[PDB]
Short mmCIF file of C-alpha atoms and ligand atoms in Angstrom, two decimals:
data_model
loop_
_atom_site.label_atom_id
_atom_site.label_comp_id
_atom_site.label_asym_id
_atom_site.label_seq_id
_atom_site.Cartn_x
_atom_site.Cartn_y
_atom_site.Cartn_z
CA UNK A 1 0.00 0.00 0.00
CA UNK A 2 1.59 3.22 -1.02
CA UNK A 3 0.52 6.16 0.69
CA UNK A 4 1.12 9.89 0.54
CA UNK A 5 0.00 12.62 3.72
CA UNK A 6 0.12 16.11 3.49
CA UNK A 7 0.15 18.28 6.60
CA UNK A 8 0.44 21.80 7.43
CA UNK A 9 -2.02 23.04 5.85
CA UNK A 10 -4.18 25.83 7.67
CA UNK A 11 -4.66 29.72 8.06
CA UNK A 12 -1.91 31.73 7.06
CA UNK A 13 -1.39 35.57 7.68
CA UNK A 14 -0.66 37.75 4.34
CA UNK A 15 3.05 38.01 4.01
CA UNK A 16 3.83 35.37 6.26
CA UNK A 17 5.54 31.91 5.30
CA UNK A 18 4.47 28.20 5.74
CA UNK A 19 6.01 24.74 5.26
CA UNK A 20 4.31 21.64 4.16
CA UNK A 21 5.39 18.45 4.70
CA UNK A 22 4.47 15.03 2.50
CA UNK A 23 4.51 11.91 4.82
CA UNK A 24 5.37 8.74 2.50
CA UNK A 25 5.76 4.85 2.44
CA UNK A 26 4.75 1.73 0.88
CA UNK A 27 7.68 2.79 -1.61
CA UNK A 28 11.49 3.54 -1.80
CA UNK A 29 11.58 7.12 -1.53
CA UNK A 30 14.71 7.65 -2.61
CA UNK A 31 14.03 6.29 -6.02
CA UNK A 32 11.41 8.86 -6.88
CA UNK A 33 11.30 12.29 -8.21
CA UNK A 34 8.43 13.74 -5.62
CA UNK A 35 6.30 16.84 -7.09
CA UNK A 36 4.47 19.29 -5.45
CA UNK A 37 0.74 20.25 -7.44
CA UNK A 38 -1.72 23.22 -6.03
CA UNK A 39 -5.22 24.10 -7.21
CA UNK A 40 -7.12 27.11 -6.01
CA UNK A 41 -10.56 27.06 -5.33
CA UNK A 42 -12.76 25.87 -8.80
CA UNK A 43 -9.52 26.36 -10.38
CA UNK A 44 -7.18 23.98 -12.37
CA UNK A 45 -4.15 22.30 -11.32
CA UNK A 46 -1.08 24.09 -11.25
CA UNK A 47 2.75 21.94 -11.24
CA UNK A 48 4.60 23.87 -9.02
CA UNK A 49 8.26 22.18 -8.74
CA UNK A 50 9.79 18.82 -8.25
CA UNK A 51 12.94 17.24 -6.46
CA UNK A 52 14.72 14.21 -8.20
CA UNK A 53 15.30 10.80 -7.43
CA UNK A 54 18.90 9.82 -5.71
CA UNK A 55 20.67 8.90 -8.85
CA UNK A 56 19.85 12.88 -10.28
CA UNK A 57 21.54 14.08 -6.76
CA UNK A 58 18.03 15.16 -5.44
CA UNK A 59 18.41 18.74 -7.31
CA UNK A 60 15.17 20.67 -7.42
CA UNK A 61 13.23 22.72 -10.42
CA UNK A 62 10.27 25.20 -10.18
CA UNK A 63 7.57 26.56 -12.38
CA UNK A 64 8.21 30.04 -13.28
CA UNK A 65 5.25 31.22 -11.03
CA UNK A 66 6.97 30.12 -8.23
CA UNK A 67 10.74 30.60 -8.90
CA UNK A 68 12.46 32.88 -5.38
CA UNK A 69 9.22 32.13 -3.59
CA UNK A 70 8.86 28.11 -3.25
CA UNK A 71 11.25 26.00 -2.01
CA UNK A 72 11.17 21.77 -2.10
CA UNK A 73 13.37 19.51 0.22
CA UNK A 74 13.31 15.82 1.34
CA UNK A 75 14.47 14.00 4.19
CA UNK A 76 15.35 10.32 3.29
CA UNK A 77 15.61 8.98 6.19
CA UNK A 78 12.48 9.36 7.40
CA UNK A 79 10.73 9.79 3.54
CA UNK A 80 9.18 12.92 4.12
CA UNK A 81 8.87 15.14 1.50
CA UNK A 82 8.36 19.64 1.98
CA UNK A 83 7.32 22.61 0.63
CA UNK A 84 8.92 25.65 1.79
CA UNK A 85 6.50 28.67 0.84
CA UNK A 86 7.63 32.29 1.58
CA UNK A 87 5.78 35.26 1.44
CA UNK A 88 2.70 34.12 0.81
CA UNK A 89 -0.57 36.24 -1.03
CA UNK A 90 -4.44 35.49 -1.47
CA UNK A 91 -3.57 34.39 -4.69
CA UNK A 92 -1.66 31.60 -2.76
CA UNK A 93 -4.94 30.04 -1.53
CA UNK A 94 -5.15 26.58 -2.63
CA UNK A 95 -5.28 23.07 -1.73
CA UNK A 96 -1.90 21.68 -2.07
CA UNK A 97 -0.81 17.89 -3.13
CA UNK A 98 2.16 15.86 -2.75
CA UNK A 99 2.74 13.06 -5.91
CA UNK A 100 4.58 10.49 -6.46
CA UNK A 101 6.73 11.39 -9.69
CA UNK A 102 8.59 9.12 -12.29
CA UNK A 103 11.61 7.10 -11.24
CA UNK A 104 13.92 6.49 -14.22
CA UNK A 105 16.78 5.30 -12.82
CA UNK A 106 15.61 1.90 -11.31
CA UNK A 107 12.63 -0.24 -11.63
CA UNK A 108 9.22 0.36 -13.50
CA UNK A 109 9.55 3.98 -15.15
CA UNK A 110 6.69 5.23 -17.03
CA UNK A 111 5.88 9.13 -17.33
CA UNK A 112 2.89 9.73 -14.60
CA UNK A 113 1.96 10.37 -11.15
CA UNK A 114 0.93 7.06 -9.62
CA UNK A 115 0.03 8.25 -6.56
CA UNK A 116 -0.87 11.38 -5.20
CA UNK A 117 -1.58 12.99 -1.04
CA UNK A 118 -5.62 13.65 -0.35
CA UNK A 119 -4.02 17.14 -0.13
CA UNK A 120 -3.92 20.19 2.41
CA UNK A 121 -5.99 23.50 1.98
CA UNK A 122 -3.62 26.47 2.57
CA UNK A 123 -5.54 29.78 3.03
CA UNK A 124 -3.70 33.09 3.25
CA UNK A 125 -5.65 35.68 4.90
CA UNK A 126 -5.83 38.44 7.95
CA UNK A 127 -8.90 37.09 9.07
CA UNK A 128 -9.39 35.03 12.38
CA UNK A 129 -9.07 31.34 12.52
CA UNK A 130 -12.97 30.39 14.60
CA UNK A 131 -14.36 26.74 14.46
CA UNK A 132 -18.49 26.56 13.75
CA UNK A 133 -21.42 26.27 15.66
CA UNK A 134 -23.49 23.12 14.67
CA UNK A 135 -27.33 23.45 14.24
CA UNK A 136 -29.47 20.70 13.56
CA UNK A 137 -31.90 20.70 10.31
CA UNK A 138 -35.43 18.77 11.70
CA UNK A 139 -39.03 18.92 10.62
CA UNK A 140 -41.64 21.09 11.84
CA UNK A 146 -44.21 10.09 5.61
CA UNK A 147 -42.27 6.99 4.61
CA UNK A 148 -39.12 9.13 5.22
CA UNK A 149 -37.15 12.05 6.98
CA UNK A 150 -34.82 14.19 5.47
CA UNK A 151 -32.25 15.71 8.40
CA UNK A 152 -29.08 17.99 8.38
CA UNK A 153 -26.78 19.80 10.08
CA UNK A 154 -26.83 23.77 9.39
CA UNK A 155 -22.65 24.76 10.00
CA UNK A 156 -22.30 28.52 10.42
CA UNK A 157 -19.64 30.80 11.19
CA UNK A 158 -16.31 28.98 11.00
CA UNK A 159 -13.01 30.25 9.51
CA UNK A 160 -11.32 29.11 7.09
CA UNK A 161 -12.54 26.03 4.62
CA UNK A 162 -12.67 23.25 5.14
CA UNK A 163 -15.67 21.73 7.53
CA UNK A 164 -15.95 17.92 6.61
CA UNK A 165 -19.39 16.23 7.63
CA UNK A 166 -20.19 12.77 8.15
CA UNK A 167 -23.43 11.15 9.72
CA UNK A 168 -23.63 8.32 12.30
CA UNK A 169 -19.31 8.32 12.65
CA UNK A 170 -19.13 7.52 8.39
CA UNK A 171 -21.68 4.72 8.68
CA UNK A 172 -24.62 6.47 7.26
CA UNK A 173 -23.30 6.94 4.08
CA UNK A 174 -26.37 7.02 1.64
CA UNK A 175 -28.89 9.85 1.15
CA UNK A 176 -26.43 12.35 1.90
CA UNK A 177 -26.57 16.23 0.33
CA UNK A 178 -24.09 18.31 1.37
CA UNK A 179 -24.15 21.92 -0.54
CA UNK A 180 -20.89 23.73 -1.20
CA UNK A 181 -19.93 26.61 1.08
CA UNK A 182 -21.11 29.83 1.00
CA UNK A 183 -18.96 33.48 2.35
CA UNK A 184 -20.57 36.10 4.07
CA UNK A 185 -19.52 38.76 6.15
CA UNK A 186 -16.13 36.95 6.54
CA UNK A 187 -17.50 33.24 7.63
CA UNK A 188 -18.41 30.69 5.67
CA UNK A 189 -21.72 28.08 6.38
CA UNK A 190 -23.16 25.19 4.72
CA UNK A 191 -25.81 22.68 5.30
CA UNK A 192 -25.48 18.61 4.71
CA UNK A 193 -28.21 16.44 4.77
CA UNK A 194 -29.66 12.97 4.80
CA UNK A 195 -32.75 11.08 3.76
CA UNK A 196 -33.04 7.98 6.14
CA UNK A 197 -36.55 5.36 6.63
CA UNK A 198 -39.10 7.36 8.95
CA UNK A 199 -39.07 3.92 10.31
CA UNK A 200 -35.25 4.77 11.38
CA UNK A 201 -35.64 7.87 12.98
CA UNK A 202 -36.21 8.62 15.85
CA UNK A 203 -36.70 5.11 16.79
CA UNK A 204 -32.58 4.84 16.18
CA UNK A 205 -29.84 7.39 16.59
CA UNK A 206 -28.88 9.88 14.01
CA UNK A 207 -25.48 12.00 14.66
CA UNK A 208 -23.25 14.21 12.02
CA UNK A 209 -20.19 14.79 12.77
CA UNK A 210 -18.76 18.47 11.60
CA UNK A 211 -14.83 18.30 11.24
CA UNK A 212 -12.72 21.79 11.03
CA UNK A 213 -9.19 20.98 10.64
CA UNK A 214 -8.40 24.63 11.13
CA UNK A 215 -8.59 24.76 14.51
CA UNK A 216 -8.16 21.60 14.77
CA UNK A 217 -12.22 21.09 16.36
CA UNK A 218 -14.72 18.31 15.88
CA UNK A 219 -17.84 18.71 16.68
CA UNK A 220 -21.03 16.21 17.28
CA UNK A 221 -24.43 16.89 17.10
CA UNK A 222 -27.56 14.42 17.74
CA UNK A 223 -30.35 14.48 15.82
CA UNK A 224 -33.78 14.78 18.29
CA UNK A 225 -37.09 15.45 17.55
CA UNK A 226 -38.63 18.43 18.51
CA UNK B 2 5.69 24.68 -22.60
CA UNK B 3 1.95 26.35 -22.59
CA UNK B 4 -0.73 23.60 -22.40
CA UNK B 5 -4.31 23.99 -23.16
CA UNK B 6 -7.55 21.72 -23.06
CA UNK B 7 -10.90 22.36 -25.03
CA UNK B 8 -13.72 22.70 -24.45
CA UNK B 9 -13.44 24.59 -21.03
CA UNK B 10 -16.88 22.04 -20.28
CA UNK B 11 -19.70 20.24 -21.64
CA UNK B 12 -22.56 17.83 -20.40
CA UNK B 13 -23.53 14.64 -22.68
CA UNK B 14 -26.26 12.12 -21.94
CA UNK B 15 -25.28 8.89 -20.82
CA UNK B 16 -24.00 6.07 -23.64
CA UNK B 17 -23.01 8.97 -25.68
CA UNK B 18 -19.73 9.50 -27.03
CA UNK B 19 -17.39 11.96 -25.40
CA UNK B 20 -14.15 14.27 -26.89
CA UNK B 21 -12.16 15.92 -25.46
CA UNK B 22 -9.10 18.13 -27.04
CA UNK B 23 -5.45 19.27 -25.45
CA UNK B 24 -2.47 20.92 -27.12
CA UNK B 25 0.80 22.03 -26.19
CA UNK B 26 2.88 25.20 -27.40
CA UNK B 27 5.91 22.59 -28.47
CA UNK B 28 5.56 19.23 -29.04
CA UNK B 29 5.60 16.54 -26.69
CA UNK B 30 6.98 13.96 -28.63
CA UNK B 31 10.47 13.00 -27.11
CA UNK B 32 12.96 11.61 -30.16
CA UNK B 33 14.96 10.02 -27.60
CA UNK B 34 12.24 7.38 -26.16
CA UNK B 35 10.12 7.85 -29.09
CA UNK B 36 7.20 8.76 -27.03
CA UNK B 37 4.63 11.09 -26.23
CA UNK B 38 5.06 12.74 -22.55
CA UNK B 39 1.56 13.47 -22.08
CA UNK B 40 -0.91 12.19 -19.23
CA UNK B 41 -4.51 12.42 -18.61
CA UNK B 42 -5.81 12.81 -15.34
CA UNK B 43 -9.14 12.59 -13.72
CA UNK B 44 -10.65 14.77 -10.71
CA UNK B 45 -14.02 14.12 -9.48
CA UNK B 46 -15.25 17.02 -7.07
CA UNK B 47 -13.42 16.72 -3.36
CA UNK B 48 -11.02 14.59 -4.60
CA UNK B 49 -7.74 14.26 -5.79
CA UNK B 50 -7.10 13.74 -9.65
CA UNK B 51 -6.13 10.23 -10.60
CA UNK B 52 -3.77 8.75 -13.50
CA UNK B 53 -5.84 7.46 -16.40
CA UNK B 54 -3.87 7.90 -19.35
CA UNK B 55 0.16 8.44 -19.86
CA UNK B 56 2.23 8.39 -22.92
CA UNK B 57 -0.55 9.89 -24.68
CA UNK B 58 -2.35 6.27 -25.55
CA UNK B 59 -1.50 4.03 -22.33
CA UNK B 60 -4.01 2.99 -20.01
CA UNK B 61 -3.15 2.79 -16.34
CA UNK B 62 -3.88 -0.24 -14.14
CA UNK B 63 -7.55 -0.62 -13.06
CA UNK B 64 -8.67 2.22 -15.84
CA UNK B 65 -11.27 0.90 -18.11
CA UNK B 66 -11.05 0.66 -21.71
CA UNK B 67 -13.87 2.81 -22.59
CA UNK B 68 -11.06 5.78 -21.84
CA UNK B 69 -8.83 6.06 -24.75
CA UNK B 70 -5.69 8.62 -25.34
CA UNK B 71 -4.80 9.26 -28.75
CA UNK B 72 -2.86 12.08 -30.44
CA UNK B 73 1.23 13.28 -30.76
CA UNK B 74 3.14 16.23 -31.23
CA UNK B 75 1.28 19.16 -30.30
CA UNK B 76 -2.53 17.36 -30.55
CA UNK B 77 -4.05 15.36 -28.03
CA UNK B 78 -7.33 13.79 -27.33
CA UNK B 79 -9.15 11.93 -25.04
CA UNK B 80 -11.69 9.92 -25.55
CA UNK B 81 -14.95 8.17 -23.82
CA UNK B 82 -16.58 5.45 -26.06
CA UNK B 83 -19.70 5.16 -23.35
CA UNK B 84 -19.79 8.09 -20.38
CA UNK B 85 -21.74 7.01 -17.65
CA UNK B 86 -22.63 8.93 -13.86
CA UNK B 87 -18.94 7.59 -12.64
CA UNK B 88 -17.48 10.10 -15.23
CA UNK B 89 -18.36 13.29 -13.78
CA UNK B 90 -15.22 15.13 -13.31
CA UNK B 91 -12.78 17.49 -14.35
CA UNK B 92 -10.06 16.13 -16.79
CA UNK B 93 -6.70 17.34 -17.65
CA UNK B 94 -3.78 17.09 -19.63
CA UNK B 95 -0.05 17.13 -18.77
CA UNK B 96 2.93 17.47 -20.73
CA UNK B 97 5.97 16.10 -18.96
CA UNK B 98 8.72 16.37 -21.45
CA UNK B 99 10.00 19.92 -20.02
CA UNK B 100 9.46 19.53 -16.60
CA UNK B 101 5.49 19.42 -16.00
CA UNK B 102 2.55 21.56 -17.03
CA UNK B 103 -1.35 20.96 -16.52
CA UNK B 104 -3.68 22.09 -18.95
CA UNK B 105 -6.54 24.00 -18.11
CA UNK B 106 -9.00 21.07 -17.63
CA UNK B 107 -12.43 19.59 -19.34
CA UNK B 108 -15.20 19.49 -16.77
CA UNK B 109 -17.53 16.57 -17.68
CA UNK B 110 -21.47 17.37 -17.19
CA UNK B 111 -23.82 14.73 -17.35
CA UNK B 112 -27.51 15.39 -19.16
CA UNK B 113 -30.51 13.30 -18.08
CA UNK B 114 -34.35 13.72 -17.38
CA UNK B 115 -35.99 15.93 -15.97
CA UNK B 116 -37.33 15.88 -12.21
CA UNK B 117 -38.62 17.41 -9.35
CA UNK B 118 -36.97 18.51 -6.10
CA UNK B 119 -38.60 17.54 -3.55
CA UNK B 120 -39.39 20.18 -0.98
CA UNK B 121 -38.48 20.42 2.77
CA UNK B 122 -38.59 23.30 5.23
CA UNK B 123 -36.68 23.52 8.53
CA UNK B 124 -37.48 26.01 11.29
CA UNK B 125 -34.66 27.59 12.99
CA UNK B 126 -33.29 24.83 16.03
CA UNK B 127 -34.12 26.00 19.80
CA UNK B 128 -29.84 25.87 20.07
CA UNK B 129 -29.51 28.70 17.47
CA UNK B 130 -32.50 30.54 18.85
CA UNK B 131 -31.12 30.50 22.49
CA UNK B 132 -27.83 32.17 21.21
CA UNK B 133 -30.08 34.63 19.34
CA UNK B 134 -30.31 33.13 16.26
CA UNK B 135 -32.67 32.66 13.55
CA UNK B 136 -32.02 30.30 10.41
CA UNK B 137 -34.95 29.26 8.28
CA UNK B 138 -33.78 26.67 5.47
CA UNK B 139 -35.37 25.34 2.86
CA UNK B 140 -34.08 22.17 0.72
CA UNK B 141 -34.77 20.76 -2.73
CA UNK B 142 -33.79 17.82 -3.41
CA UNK B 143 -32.86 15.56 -6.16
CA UNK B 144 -33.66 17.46 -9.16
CA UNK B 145 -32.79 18.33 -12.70
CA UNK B 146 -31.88 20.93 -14.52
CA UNK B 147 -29.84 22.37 -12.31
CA UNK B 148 -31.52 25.90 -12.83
CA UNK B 149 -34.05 26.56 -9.52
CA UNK B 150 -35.46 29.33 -8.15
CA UNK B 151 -37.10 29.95 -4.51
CA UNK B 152 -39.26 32.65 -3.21
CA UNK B 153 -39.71 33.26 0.54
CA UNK B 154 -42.87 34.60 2.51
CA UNK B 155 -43.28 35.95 5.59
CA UNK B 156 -46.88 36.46 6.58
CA UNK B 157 -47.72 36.64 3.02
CA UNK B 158 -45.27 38.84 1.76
CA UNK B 159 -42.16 38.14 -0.17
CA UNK B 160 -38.77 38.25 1.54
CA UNK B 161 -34.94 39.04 -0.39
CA UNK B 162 -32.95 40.83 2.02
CA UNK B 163 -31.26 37.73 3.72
CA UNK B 164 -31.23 34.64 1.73
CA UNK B 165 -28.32 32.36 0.38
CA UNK B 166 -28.44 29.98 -2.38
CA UNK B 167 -26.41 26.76 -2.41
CA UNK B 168 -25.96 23.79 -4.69
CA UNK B 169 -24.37 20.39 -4.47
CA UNK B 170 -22.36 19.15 -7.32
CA UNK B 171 -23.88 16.80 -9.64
CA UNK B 172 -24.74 13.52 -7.94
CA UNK B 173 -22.17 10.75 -8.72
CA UNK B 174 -25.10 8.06 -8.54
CA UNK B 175 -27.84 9.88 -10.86
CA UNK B 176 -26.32 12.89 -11.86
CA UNK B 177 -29.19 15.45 -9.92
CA UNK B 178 -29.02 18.26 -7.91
CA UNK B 179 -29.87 19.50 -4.24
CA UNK B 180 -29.75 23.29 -3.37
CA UNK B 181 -30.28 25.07 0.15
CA UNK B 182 -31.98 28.03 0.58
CA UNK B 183 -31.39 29.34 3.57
CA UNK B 184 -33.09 33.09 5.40
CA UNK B 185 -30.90 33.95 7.95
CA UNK B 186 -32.73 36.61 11.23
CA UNK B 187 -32.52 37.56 14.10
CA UNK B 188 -34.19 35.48 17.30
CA UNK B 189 -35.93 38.86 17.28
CA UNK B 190 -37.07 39.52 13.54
CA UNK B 191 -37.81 35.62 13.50
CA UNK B 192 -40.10 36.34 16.82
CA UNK B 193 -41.99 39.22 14.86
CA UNK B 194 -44.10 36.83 12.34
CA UNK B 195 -45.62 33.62 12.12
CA UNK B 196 -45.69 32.35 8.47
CA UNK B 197 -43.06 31.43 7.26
CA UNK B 198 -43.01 29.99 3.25
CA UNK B 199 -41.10 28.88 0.77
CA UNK B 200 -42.09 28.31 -2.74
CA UNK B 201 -40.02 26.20 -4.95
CA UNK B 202 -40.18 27.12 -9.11
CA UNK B 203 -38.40 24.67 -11.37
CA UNK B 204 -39.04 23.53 -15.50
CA UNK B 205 -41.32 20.68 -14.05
CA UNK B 206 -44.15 22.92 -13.53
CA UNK B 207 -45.68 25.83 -13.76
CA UNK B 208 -47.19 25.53 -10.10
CA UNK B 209 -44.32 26.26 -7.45
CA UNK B 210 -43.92 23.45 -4.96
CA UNK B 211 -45.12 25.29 -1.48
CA UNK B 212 -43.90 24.13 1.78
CA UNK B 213 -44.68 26.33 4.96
CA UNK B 214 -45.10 26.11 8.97
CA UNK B 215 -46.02 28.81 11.75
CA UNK B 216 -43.69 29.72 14.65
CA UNK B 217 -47.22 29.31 16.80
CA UNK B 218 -46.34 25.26 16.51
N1 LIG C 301 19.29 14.70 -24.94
C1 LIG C 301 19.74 13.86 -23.79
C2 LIG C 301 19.61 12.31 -24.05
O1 LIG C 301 20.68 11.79 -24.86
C3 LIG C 301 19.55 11.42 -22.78
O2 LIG C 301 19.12 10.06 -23.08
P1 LIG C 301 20.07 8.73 -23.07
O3 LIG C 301 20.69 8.33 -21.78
O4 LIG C 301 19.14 7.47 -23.57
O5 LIG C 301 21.13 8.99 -24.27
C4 LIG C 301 18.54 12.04 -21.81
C5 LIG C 301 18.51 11.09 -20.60
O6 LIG C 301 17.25 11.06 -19.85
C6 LIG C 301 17.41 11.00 -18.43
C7 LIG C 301 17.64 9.51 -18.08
O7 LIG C 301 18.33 9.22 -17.06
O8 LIG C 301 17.11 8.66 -18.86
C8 LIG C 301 16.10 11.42 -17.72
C9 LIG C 301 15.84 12.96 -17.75
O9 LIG C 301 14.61 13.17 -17.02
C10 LIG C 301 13.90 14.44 -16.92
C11 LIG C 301 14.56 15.42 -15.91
O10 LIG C 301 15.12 14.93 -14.88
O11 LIG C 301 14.49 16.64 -16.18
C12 LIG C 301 12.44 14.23 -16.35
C13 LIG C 301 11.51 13.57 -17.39
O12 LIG C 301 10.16 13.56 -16.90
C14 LIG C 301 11.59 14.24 -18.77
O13 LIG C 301 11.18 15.57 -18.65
C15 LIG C 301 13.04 14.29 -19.22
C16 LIG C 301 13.33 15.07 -20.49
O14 LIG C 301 12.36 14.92 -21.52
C17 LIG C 301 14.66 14.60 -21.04
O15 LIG C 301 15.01 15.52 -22.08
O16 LIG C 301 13.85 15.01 -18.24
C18 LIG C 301 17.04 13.71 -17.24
O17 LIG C 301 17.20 13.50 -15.83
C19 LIG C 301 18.26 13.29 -18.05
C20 LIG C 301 19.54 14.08 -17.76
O18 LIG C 301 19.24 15.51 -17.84
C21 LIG C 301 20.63 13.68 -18.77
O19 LIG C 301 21.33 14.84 -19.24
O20 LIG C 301 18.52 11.85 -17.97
O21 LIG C 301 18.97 13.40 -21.51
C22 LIG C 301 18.90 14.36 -22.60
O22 LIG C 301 19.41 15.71 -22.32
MG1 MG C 302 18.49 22.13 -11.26
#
């Protein structure tokens, strides 16, 4: 199982700097170029820079966006891969992945990244890092539709999941939304009246951010 | 090296045929390995893209064969013999023969028939309230086109000043929609009426889908 983790990611001030680091195994690190790949909100992806494999003497490249600004490393001894950003802007604002690149100089070599991170959202702003409040969506038929209304948290993301990641089907969650400097959204699920309230239903509102979870049971009114 | 990908987006029906086009400013085609150095990648919504095509025509392990690359030089194409509700996603190209360079990307739409939404309405939650809050949301769900509008009443007259709109992506299973509406008060404002409406207008019908309750329940 080869596996790639991004961490880091978070809030950061306007002007300020940030490093990201790409946990890896399942592989010999050493063997592989390692690139770095951001995408801004609804925007495309963008190749930022690589670091070679071992044979190439690890030496590093960088898109000309980047060039003075980004800076990659490795350790390989403990096959973690970084980003070094520097002075970062708005403009800066994207989720940032970690990929597996080509190895040429031993084994299976085939122009692609195999594997990539589940990526880390990096948001530059002056604005104040706050987790949400949780509301619960409930009725005033064969089934009920629920939710979970998340409001005022700062910045993306808030992840939602219902019953722990076990109630998996029927659920609607809406993208985000900014206003007045927080953003809210609303996911919800369509279960069996015959499930609810007779059973428990729970959503559980992530915001890696501030590093908060939050749980919220579903009762009738 | 400048990459771009055409057409910026479209939406086909399922079974139909799908193409999509990507070219480079030189031309990928390395004289040396005698190869194209150009990938295709696939990115459904909240996820991270995935390898289905590199060397222009070779098909990674575990992609299916209804995804074909084709193309060299400066032209490339990828193609889907049969898309079905799995496919929706944005694609995109990437030369790798001067270091490495996305293209701009093909989202993939999905077209299919036409249905309702079906209609809920939440009253604000007694947490919310007892912090002074006043949320009033209204959800349709499961419906297609994506184009939806919703008109909220208070006591009989229409409300603007207040509301958000919000819509999923297309579903991955059957390719419809669900949107929020939400009116956002005060516990005070909220506290000042009773009837509280919204009225849902899609292409299904002319009649707007009404859904309503009274803060006296
Ligand atoms: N023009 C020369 C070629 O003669 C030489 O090939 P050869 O050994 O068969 O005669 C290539 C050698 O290619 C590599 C290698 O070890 O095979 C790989 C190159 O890889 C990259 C790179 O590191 O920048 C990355 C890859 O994705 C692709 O971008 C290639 C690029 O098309 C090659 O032009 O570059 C690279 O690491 C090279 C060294 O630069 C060798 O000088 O070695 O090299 C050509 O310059
Ligand atoms: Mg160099």
């Amino acid at each position: 199982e080869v596996m790639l983790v991004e961490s880091g990611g978070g809030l950061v001030q306007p002007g300020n700097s940030l490093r990201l680091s790409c946990a890896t195994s399942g592989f010999t690190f050493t063997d592989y170029y390692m690139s770095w790949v951001r995408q801004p909100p609804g925007k495309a992806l963008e190749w930022l820079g690589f670091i070679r494999n071992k044979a190439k003497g690890y030496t590093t490249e960088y898109s000309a966006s980047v060039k003075g600004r980004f800076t990659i490393s490795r350790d390989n001894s403990q096959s973690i891969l970084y980003l070094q950003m520097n002075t970062l802007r708005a403009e800066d604002s994207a989720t940032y992945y970690c990929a597996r690149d080509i190895s040429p100089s031993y084994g299976v070599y085939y122009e692609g990244f195999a594997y990539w991170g589940q990526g880390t959202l990096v948001t530059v702003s002056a604005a104040t890092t706050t987790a949400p409040s949780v509301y619960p969506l409930v009725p005033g038929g064969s089934s009920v539709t629920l939710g979970c209304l998340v409001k005022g948290y700062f910045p993306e993301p808030v992840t939602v999941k219902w019953n722990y990641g076990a109630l998996s089907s029927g659920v609607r969650t809406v993208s985000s939304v900014l206003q007045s400097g927080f953003y809210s959204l609303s996911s919800l699920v369509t279960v069996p009246s015959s499930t609810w309230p007779s059973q428990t239903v729970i959503c559980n509102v992530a915001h890696p951010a501030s590093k908060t979870e939050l749980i919220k049971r579903i009762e009738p009114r | 090296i400048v990459m771009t990908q055409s057409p910026s987006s479209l939406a086909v029906s399922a079974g139909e045929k799908v193409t999509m086009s990507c070219k480079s400013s030189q031309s990928l085609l390395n004289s040396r390995t005698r190869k194209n150095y150009l990938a295709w990648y696939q990115q459904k919504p909240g996820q991270s893209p995935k390898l289905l095509i590199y060397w222009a025509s070779t098909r990674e392990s575990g992609v299916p064969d209804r995804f074909t690359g084709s193309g060299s030089g400066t032209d490339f194409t990828l193609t889907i013999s049969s898309v079905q509700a799995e496919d929706l996603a944005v694609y995109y190209c990437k030369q790798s023969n001067n270091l490495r360079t996305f293209g701009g990307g093909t989202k993939l739409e999905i077209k299919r028939a036409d249905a309702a939404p079906t209609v809920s309405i939440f009253p604000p939650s007694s947490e919310q309230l007892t912090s002074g809050g006043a949320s009033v949301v209204c959800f349709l769900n499961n419906f297609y086109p994506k184009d939806i509008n919703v008109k909220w009443k208070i006591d009989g007259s229409e409300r603007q000043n207040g509301v958000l709109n919000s819509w999923t992506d297309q579903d991955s299973k059957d390719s419809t929609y669900s949107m929020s509406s939400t009116l956002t008060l005060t516990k005070d404002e909220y506290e000042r009426h009773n009837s509280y409406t919204c009225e849902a207008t899609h292409k299904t019908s002319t009649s707007p889908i009404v859904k309503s309750f009274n803060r006296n329940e």
